[PDB]
């Protein structure tokens, strides 16, 4: 997750949907690794 | 139309797939949308 | 898009987010091919 | 917790990636969430 990309979307609600997911996808990179590995282990 | 920026190739690809689905949904013949939503209300 | 899959999620808002996207992803299969191909052509 | 059902392997995979991001977001140390949201308010 190093390079940045622009995205265009039509529709205010579509924009808000995508922004909520952009936030979650970018924030997940900040979870400390032991917490990620645990989450992933339990999802089995 | 709105812009957003996202960091990371996989994140961009996911968001693009979703953008495509949200915009294509507007091209579905409306009776098929109506049927889909009715079948779902029947279930849930 | 033939087999069906169950998904569990924690959080009412997370559930509503995912349901909105599930709907768009399933509905996009119903767009007539000439409309899909056109949309995809113009996104270049 | 809620269930949903989705038709199609690629659709399931997308929704799973998003479910993971939404649930992992809750494990991010809150000051890092705060910083992220501040940097975004600075921009937009």
Swiss-Prot record, chains A, C:
Induction text: Not induced by DNA damage. Isoforms lacking the transactivation domain block gene induction.
Region listing for Oligomerization, in residue ranges: 1-36
Tissue expression remark: Expressed in striatal neurons of patients with Huntington disease (at protein level). Brain, kidney, placenta, colon, heart, liver, spleen, skeletal muscle, prostate, thymus and pancreas. Highly expressed in fetal tissue. Expressed in the respiratory epithelium.
Compartments, record wording: Nucleus; Cytoplasm
Chain intervals for the UniProt region annotation (Interaction with HIPK2): 1-30
Post-translational modification: Phosphorylation by PLK1 and PLK3 inhibits the transcription regulator activity and pro-apoptotic function. Higher levels of phosphorylation seen in the brain from patients with Huntington disease.
Family per similarity comment: Belongs to the p53 family.
Disease: Ciliary dyskinesia, primary, 47, and lissencephaly: A form of primary ciliary dyskinesia, a disorder characterized by abnormalities of motile cilia. Respiratory infections leading to chronic inflammation and bronchiectasis are recurrent, due to defects in the respiratory cilia. CILD47 is an autosomal recessive form characterized by onset soon after birth or in early childhood.
Miscellaneous section: Maps to a chromosome region frequently mutated in diverse cell lines of human cancer. Appears not to be frequently mutated in human cancers, in contrast to p53/TP53. Hemizygosity is observed in neuroblastoma and oligodendroglioma. Activated and stabilized by interaction with RANBP9.
Domain notes per entry: Possesses an acidic transactivation domain, a central DNA binding domain and a C-terminal oligomerization domain that binds to the ABL1 tyrosine kinase SH3 domain.
Subunit text: Found in a complex with p53/TP53 and CABLES1. The C-terminal oligomerization domain binds to the ABL1 tyrosine kinase SH3 domain. Interacts with HECW2. Isoform Beta interacts homotypically and with p53/TP53, whereas isoform Alpha does not. Isoform Gamma interacts homotypically and with all p73 isoforms. Isoform Delta interacts with isoform Gamma, isoform Alpha, and homotypically. Isoforms Alpha and Beta interact with HIPK2. Isoform Alpha interacts with RANBP9. Isoform Beta interacts with WWOX. Interacts (via SAM domain) with FBXO45 (via B30.2/SPRY domain).
This protein's name: Tumor protein p73
Organism the protein comes from: Homo sapiens
Origin organism lineage: Eukaryota, Metazoa, Chordata, Craniata, Vertebrata
From Swiss-Prot, chains B, D:
Region (Interaction with HIPK2): 1-27
Domain notes: Possesses an acidic transactivation domain, a central DNA binding domain and a C-terminal oligomerization domain that binds to the ABL1 tyrosine kinase SH3 domain. The PPxY motif mediates interaction with WWOX.
Subcellular localization, as worded in the UniProt entry: Nucleus; Cytoplasm
Organism lineage string: Eukaryota, Metazoa, Chordata, Craniata, Vertebrata
Connected disease: Ciliary dyskinesia, primary, 47, and lissencephaly: A form of primary ciliary dyskinesia, a disorder characterized by abnormalities of motile cilia. Respiratory infections leading to chronic inflammation and bronchiectasis are recurrent, due to defects in the respiratory cilia. CILD47 is an autosomal recessive form characterized by onset soon after birth or in early childhood.
Region feature (Oligomerization): 1-33
Signal peptide: none
Function: Participates in the apoptotic response to DNA damage. Isoforms containing the transactivation domain are pro-apoptotic, isoforms lacking the domain are anti-apoptotic and block the function of p53 and transactivating p73 isoforms. May be a tumor suppressor protein. Is an activator of FOXJ1 expression. It is an essential factor for the positive regulation of lung ciliated cell differentiation.
Entry similarity comment: Belongs to the p53 family.
Induction / repression: Not induced by DNA damage. Isoforms lacking the transactivation domain block gene induction.
Disulfide bonds, paired cysteine numbers: none
Subunit structure: Found in a complex with p53/TP53 and CABLES1. The C-terminal oligomerization domain binds to the ABL1 tyrosine kinase SH3 domain. Interacts with HECW2. Isoform Beta interacts homotypically and with p53/TP53, whereas isoform Alpha does not. Isoform Gamma interacts homotypically and with all p73 isoforms. Isoform Delta interacts with isoform Gamma, isoform Alpha, and homotypically. Isoforms Alpha and Beta interact with HIPK2. Isoform Alpha interacts with RANBP9. Isoform Beta interacts with WWOX. Interacts (via SAM domain) with FBXO45 (via B30.2/SPRY domain).
Protein name in UniProt: Tumor protein p73
Other remarks in the entry: Maps to a chromosome region frequently mutated in diverse cell lines of human cancer. Appears not to be frequently mutated in human cancers, in contrast to p53/TP53. Hemizygosity is observed in neuroblastoma and oligodendroglioma.
Distribution of this protein across tissues and organs: Expressed in striatal neurons of patients with Huntington disease (at protein level). Brain, kidney, placenta, colon, heart, liver, spleen, skeletal muscle, prostate, thymus and pancreas. Highly expressed in fetal tissue. Expressed in the respiratory epithelium.
Mod. after translation: Phosphorylation by PLK1 and PLK3 inhibits the transcription regulator activity and pro-apoptotic function. Higher levels of phosphorylation seen in the brain from patients with Huntington disease.
Organism: Homo sapiens (Human)
């Amino acid at each position: 997750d190093e390079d940045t990309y622009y995205l265009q979307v039509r529709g205010r609600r579509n924009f808000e949907i995508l922004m909520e997911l952009k936030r979650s996808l970018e924030l997940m990179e900040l979870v400390p690794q032991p917490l990620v590995d645990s989450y992933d282990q339990q999802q089995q």
